[PDB]
Paper text:
Crenarchaea, one of the two major phyla of cultured archaea, possesses a number of small and basic chromatin proteins, including Sul7d, CC1 and Cren7. This protein preferentially binds dsDNA over ssDNA and changes the DNA geometry in vitro. Similar to other Cren7-DNA complexes reported previously, Cren7 binds to the mismatched DNA duplex in the minor groove as a monomer, covering almost all the eight base pairs.
Meanwhile, two complexes are in the asymmetric unit of Cren7-GTGATCGC, which are related by a perfect non-crystallographic 2-fold symmetry axis with a root-mean-square deviation (RMSD) value of 0.018 Å between them. By contrast, both T:G mispairs in the GC-rich DNA duplex (GTGATCGC) retained classic wobble type. To learn more about the atomic details of the unusual T2:G15 base pairing, the structures of all the T:G mispairs in the Cren7-DNA complexes are compared. Both T:G base pairs in the Cren7-GTGATCGC complex form a classic wobble pair with hydrogen bonds from G-O6 to T-N3 (2.74 Å for G7:T10 and 2.72 Å for G15:T2) and from G-N1 to T-O2 (2.91 Å for G7:T10 and 2.83 Å for G15:T2). The bound Cren7 induces a sharp kink (~50°) to the major groove by the intercalation of the side chain of Leu28 into the A3A4 step of d(GTAATTGC)2, while a smaller kink (~48°) is observed at the G3A4 step for d(GTGATCGC)2. The average conformational parameters of the base pair steps in GTGATCGC resembles those in GCGATCGC bound by Cren7. It suggests that the existence of T:G mispairs has little effects on the conformation of GC-rich DNA bound by Cren7. A similar case is found for GTGATCGC, with the values of the corresponding steps being about 15.4°and 18.8°, respectively. Cren7 showed a 1.3-fold reduction in the binding affinity for GTGATCGC as compared to that for GCGATCGC. This was resulted from the combined effects of a slightly decreased association rate (ka) and a slightly increased dissociation rate (kd), indicating that the presence of T:G wobble base pairs had limited effects on both Cren7-DNA contacts and the stability of Cren7-DNA complex. Although predictions based on pairing of the complementary bases and the stacking of pairs suggested no obvious sequence dependent base pair opening probabilities, Cren7 may prefer to induce the opening of T:G base pair in the AT-rich DNA sequences, as the fact that both T:G base pairs in the Cren7-GTGATCGC complex retain the classic wobble type.
Author numbering: 2 to 60
DNA sequence: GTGATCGC
DNA sequence: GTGATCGC
């Protein structure tokens, strides 16, 4: 499940950026809220990283 | 510990 | 096979 809307993320290199996650999913235990997680690629470094998504980002 | 995901 | 992602 890939993303469409950009997300404001802090990259591994330390910079603020607005990137479209390549994949998004819910990361939540049974009976608990959890978080939403996006898999991102830093356009500068080429490095993949995971980052929290806003709670209303569409999964 | 829990939850899913995948580049490394 | 799992680090790293988060809030509970």
């Amino acid at each position: 499940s890939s993303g469409k809307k950009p997300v404001k993320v802090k990259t591994p290199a330390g910079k603020e950026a607005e990137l479209v996650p390549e994949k998004v999913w819910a990361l939540a235990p049974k009976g608990r809220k959890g978080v939403k997680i996006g898999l991102f690629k830093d356009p500068e470094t080429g490095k993949y990283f995971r980052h929290k998504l806003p709670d209303d980002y569409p999964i």
